[PDB]
Nucleic acid binder design. Sequence first.
RNA 1: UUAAUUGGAUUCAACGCCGGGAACCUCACCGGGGGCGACGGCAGGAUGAAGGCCAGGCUGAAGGUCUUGCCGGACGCGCCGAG
Lengths: 45, 123, 50, 115
Amino acid sequence: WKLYEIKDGKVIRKNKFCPRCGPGVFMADHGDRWACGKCGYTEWK
Amino acid sequence: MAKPSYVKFEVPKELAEKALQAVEIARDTGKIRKGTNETTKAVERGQAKLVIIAEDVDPEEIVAHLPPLCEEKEIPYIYVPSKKELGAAAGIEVAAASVAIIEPGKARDLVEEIAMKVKELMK
Amino acid sequence: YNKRKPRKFGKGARRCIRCGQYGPIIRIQGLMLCRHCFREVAPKLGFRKY
Amino acid sequence: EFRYRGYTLEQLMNMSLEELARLFPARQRRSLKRGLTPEQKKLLRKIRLAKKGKYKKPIRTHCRDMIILPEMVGLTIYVHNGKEFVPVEIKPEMIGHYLGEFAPTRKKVEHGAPG
RNA sequence: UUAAUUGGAUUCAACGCCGGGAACCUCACCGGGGGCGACGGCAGGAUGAAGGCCAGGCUGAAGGUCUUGCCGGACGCGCCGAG
């Protein structure tokens, strides 16, 4: 719930959605990379 | 006792009892998501078919996001007066502030009814 | 981490069926038995002293 | 100067591992031919990074059968003999011999009065 | 003597004996590190793992350890009896 903000009628997500498992998958916001903690898949920024 | 800000309609007592019955039957022969981050994930995932929310939740933020997000995703929502009642209907000792049903199971006939009684509440 | 390494070779690759000793294990046609265990099992195995 | 099969330290360094192993004994060349374990490659990466300067940690190790290569010359590493990681330093003359030869696994055996 | 040459075996009736095969193992010896106490009572519980996850400093070394950022959805930390 903390990662979910709401502004003017839309839900903002702090972390991004890992595309392998679909939505609902928050994954590492490391600043330099978007890493997923479930399998180690890393999409560098 | 004024209703909190996230309230958009008044749920009668019989409708709250029916919602708790639906929660119990979905716990028995279906699937419910205890906890509010899981409910948010379900509503985002679209698996949530009805979001039951407690009215006496001391922190407003946990339940504040549910009404506008549910209305955005066209997933009906209902209220129950006590988070303790929602937790007891959830089969867990600790209080569950929000429960999103995924498979009503044998509660569908109630849930589809309750959803109907939800659809008249916003009008 | 809590698993012993597989061993297809050496003495450690053979641990007797009955007594579990890691040392003498005769495998003639695959008995897979310890030497000290063979005395209780030989006569029932059709072995006959001649 | 240092000599090994007609090549000095840098003359050994500039060449790949194939002839570099052809200069090594059978027990070393053949083992290099059959490849290195997952922890030998990791330690090689560690020491290459340290020589570059990236890995600033004092490097300890346990791989006793690690064959010293000329690339490891000029570095200090701590090798395990069973109790502690004894320090050793790699000079150009260490080429062609295992690391586990360089740690006393048995302390000196002296003699006291008989029973 | 060692950290270790593990220990047993005492003349016949101990000493090519256990070992009828020690480079990991064998290990019963030493140094170092990691991990779970089953099933209960007390306690937490869905309030979100206890399983793993990259970049790395300690780790021989491994998300073991920790800064880092998180899910997988669920009963699992811990003291006593008892394992």
